[PDB]
Amino acid sequence: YYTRGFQHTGIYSVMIQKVILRDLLRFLLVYLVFLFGFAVALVSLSREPYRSILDASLELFKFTIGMGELAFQEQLRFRGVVLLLLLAYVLLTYVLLLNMLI
Amino acid sequence: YYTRGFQHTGIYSVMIQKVILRDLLRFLLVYLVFLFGFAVALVSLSREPYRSILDASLELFKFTIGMGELAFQEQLRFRGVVLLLLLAYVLLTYVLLLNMLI
User: How far is residue A6 CA from its own chain's centroid?
Assistant: First the structure.
């Protein structure tokens, strides 16, 4: 809060709070909706390794940078659809990031 | 779909679908062509660890962020060319990303 004084160093640090708080909120809401949907989907696949909804959400949050990928061999013959869903989540996250920058 | 209403929050969210769908499609096609070519190349090296084409494609997709690097010691005396190919794939992916942003 005390960066409001000082010198010109605050010029770029005072205008961010008027557009970031408006844009990041909506975009993060959309991202969380997508993340929870994908997590529920992965739990549905793994039910019959993504045990709880919280664990799946954590995995999806890690997928953007650190992954939990390389599915466990024979995942009830649904490895292909799981991999396709993971790729789809990657593309949605990346396009949301590009929309963030734009 | 229901973000088309609301308020000014949709102003930046309606114009993205007219240029993203045109640019990302072609750039992703190019990226997939490069990825499949590099995966086939890695399979060719590893034939005589990148067993199937799907596994190699998955590894190349991971290389951009999470890697499968640190080749397995003596890879039939072809560790150097494999490492050079991996570096080349990294540079092509990065330059494609910069082209994406531009």
Answer: 36
